[PDB]
Design an enzyme around this catalytic site. Sequence first.
Site, PDB file in Angstrom:
ATOM      1  N   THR B   1       0.853  -1.218   0.000  1.00  0.00           N
ATOM      2  CA  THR B   1       0.000   0.000   0.000  1.00  0.00           C
ATOM      3  C   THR B   1       0.872   1.245   0.000  1.00  0.00           C
ATOM      4  O   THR B   1       1.926   1.286   0.632  1.00  0.00           O
ATOM      5  CB  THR B   1      -0.947   0.040   1.212  1.00  0.00           C
ATOM      6  OG1 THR B   1      -1.817  -1.102   1.184  1.00  0.00           O
ATOM      7  CG2 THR B   1      -1.788   1.332   1.212  1.00  0.00           C
ATOM      8  N   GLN B   2       0.403   2.264  -0.707  1.00  0.00           N
ATOM      9  CA  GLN B   2       1.209   3.417  -1.029  1.00  0.00           C
ATOM     10  C   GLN B   2       0.290   4.595  -1.319  1.00  0.00           C
ATOM     11  O   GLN B   2      -0.929   4.497  -1.164  1.00  0.00           O
ATOM     12  CB  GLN B   2       2.114   3.090  -2.233  1.00  0.00           C
ATOM     13  CG  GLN B   2       1.471   2.223  -3.314  1.00  0.00           C
ATOM     14  CD  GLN B   2       2.463   1.804  -4.388  1.00  0.00           C
ATOM     15  OE1 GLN B   2       2.990   0.689  -4.347  1.00  0.00           O
ATOM     16  NE2 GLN B   2       2.738   2.700  -5.349  1.00  0.00           N
ATOM     17  N   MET B 107      -1.693  -6.438  -2.201  1.00  0.00           N
ATOM     18  CA  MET B 107      -1.873  -5.195  -1.440  1.00  0.00           C
ATOM     19  C   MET B 107      -0.718  -4.221  -1.668  1.00  0.00           C
ATOM     20  O   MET B 107      -0.237  -3.572  -0.735  1.00  0.00           O
ATOM     21  CB  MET B 107      -2.069  -5.488   0.057  1.00  0.00           C
ATOM     22  CG  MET B 107      -3.349  -6.250   0.363  1.00  0.00           C
ATOM     23  SD  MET B 107      -4.824  -5.361  -0.182  1.00  0.00           S
ATOM     24  CE  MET B 107      -4.867  -4.021   1.006  1.00  0.00           C
ATOM     25  N   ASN B 108      -0.292  -4.128  -2.924  1.00  0.00           N
ATOM     26  CA  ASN B 108       0.812  -3.268  -3.330  1.00  0.00           C
ATOM     27  C   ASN B 108       0.639  -2.872  -4.802  1.00  0.00           C
ATOM     28  O   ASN B 108       1.394  -3.316  -5.665  1.00  0.00           O
ATOM     29  CB  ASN B 108       2.147  -3.987  -3.117  1.00  0.00           C
ATOM     30  CG  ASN B 108       3.344  -3.132  -3.498  1.00  0.00           C
ATOM     31  OD1 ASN B 108       4.382  -3.651  -3.907  1.00  0.00           O
ATOM     32  ND2 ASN B 108       3.204  -1.815  -3.375  1.00  0.00           N
TER      33      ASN B 108
END
Lengths: 233, 233
Positions: B1-2, B107-108
């Site tokens: 996540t970002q 999740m990235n």
Amino acid sequence: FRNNYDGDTVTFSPTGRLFQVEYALEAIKQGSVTVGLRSNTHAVLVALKRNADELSSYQKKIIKCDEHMGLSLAGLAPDARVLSNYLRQQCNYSSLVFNRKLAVERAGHLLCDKAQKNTQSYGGRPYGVGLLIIGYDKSGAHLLEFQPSGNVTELYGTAIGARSQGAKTYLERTLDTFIKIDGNPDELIKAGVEAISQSLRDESLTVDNLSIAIVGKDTPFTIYDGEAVAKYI
Amino acid sequence: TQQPIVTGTSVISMKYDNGVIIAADNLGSYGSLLRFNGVERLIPVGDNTVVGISGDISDMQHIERLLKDLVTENAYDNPLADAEEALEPSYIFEYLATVMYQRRSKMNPLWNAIIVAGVQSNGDQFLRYVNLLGVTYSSPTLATGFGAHMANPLLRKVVDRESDIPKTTVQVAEEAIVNAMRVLYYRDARSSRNFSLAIIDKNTGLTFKKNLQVENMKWDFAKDIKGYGTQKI
């Protein structure tokens, strides 16, 4: 010589030979004959299946890899199962990820590389099987010969197994005829059956003895066994 | 996540009778700072495909390098790399779609929205969308970000359903695209006046146009606007 240098695949002979690979090659020669050939529209596999008894079934030698690709085997059937499974996965990966049917040429390169790793590392063994891959992709009909040394060769027609030289000399003579058989599947199979019969000696082609496969322009890879191949004897 | 840092705004596109058009401005924003003015967000792949990318620019550059690697890798052991076995728009897209969904599933995400425009070998138009969630969809017109809200309505007045495609010309399609870029310059606070436009035509190939500017703008009426209700001077 030989005696001292054939214990494992990691050892070169004094003349630069790899005897374990060569012994694996010998398993193919003892294997039952199978023929491949193609024109510009279709590619055909024909195989002579072998039985143990008159009470036993005939070992199936053709394996479908994808809708547009498949192969025939001569040698260790368990090793053909492993290699055909890998090919099934590679074909599948190409479709899922790239929405692209795998080029028969690329399938040949992948088999070569997978066989090669077994010929250079300790503890493993070479694959003890030879394979004839047919397919129809974005550049037409294709036939490949796979040997467990890693060598893969694109041909118009060929044969492997015991007495395969008979069928090979026939095809080498018939070349100009069968390559022109475009838009006629039955006639290509006839030429394949006339080739496989060149390697006979023991017996005649019976109904549960013969196995045939075909792939082409408007033809998914499909296997014929039993009464379905009765019209070719 | 970002979180996205340097960002590109709308990418807009539509198909016409003989191919597809795609456009995107040359801005890399940094929040509300209009930081970089020479950013090309249209990535051509070969002579038949253009990928337009909005969202995080660091990720766009990573995707850019993936596409160059795809071209290289495709040419390996491929005698038909510039013929029958060249990369199709559909392959480029399916690859990108796979990556986008796998990254969201880890999740990235690659924090982007991507439009792959092109022409397949058979002549068919290719236009498909994918984003950070791995969501894919096709439509006669496609757009990302503000382009979805403001450009699609205008582009859909030209091509409202599939049957409007053969009736729509390059000239009419291009004019509609260029008008939409002007509208986005009026109402999108993260837009630039300078943009690139790419046409992929089944006959005339890839036409890439750089350093375009929004022209023929209406502003003169602003002089008559004074106050916010009751003020007269």
